[PDB]
Amino acid sequence: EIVLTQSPGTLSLSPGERASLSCRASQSLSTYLAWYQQKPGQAPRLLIFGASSRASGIPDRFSGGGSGTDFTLTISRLEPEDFAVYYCQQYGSSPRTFGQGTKVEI
Amino acid sequence: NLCPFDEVFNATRFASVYAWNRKRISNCVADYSVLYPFFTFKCYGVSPTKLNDLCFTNVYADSFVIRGDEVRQIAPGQTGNIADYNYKLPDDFTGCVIAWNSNKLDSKVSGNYNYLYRLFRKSNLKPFERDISTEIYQAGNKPCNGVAGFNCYFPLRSYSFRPTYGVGHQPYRVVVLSFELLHAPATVCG
Amino acid sequence: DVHLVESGGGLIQPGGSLRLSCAASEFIVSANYMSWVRQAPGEGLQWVSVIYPGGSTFYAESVKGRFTISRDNSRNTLYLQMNSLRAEDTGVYYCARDYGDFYFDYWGQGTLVTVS
């Protein structure tokens, strides 16, 4: 099972404009990674699939880019709604392993 | 007399797994001395050590390109995306499967998108059934109407083939030989 | 009407059996790749099982032989029967629309299963 490690355990930014979350794989995934956001007490919401493609309804502030082992998710302006937990999932191999999760604070 | 295995194995351009290329072979001596790099050779129901000295009626050579992780699905009684919706072997399959890595030929730096696989299919596939249709899949009650929107997606997904990818995701050229013995006088005799 | 609604969770003594239901609207479960994904309290997600449109089923290595995924086309429901439940199965379970066998585009509200 490809192990997905997220380098910052917690990330504490003011509601201004910056964010960066990194996901690292033990062996290469080749842009077969997805980013979900879980607000507290709510179901996860899909944001990015294919490591660079947005899904329906998520605004332009969410972007992602990576290939091989290192993948990144960045937020343009950190609006107050984006302070939640984010998960990186892989689909390159079986099964679909998730990361430990990274929680964004104020 | 020589059986045309040279065209089958050393083909320059292979076809996608959703439309796999079938070649019939008869009326030639079948000599497997030709099958002599790093490849996988799995024979089901026959002794591979004496395929040269084994005389049957027809040979069916089916060629398709798949990922390395999907090579194990080309086997009897296997379930998976390739097995269910692209290419299925029967339970009582008398033949052999030959797969070899082809990263040198079927990969480019920009990415190879000439190969496609069927992802969305309503029913399973019967053994040696070929599904060529490209009609939009209905994943909801709303009609697709010939348009690919929400809950209506194209059934064929391209492969991403790059040289820098891992071994599992690299392109593998798979040739499966199906041997048929008939009551009619056989004409494939090594 | 893209909603997925889960039900059937509750308290269960270990080794007991519980069946989870996922009722779907505007989704044809028979024509879609359906997934069950669970989350332990204050932990990461962990995919449990997936059923293909053709009918093929796969399960996570910790739950095969005890968890069975099924579908009923008549009421458009996705069922999950879990037998011989251990204490590590506690958590919130979600039914999800897996685009192919890649990623979960949609998620249900989730229901809580507590093993004693």
Numbering used by the authors:
A (entry chain D): 1 to 106
B (entry chain A): 334 to 369, 373 to 526
C (entry chain B): 1 to 116
Sentences from the paper on this structure:
The Omicron variant and its sublineages have spike glycoproteins that are highly diverged from the pandemic founder and first-generation vaccine strain, resulting in significant evasion from monoclonal antibody therapeutics and vaccines. Here, we describe several potently neutralizing IGHV3-53-using antibodies targeting the RBM, capable of Omicron cross-neutralization, extending to BA.2 and even BA.4/BA.5 sublineages. Structural analysis via cryoelectron microscopy of a representative broadly neutralizing antibody, CAB-A17, in complex with the Omicron BA.1 spike highlights the structural underpinnings of this broad neutralization. Here, we demonstrate that a common class of public antibodies can develop broad cross-neutralizing activity through affinity maturation.
To obtain a molecular understanding of the CAB-A17-Omicron RBD interaction, we used localized reconstruction techniques on a subset of the particles and thereby obtained a 2.7-Å resolution reconstruction of the paratope-epitope interface. All CDRs of the light and heavy chains of CAB-A17 interacted with the Omicron RBD through surface complementarity and specific hydrogen bonds. Remarkably, seven of the interaction-interface residues on the Omicron spike are mutated relative to the founder variant. In contrast, CAB-A17 LCDR1 SHMs, including a 1-amino acid (aa) deletion, changed the germline VSSS motif present in C102 to an LS-T. This led to a slight shortening of the backbone in a critical region close to the mutated Q498R, N501Y, and Y505H in the LC interaction area, enabling CAB-A17 to retain a favorable RBD binding mode. In the HCDR1 in CAB-A17, G26E limits the conformational variability of the loop and promotes an HCDR1-stretch main-chain position more distant to the RBD than in the gl and unbound C102. Furthermore, G26E promotes a rotamer switch of F27 from the p90 rotamer in the gl and unbound C102 to the m-85 rotamer found in CAB-A17 and C102 when bound to the RBD. Furthermore, in the HCDR2 region, the S53P SHM removes backbone conformational variability and prevents the HC-53 backbone carbonyl from the peptide-plane flip observed in gl, where it would clash with RBD Y421. Furthermore, the HCDR2 Y58F hinders a clash with RBD T415. For the LCDR1, the combination of an SHM-driven loop shortening, in combination with S31T in the loop turn that provides a hydrogen bond between T31 and the backbone carbonyl of S30, provides a significantly more rigid LCDR1 loop conformation than in C102/gl.
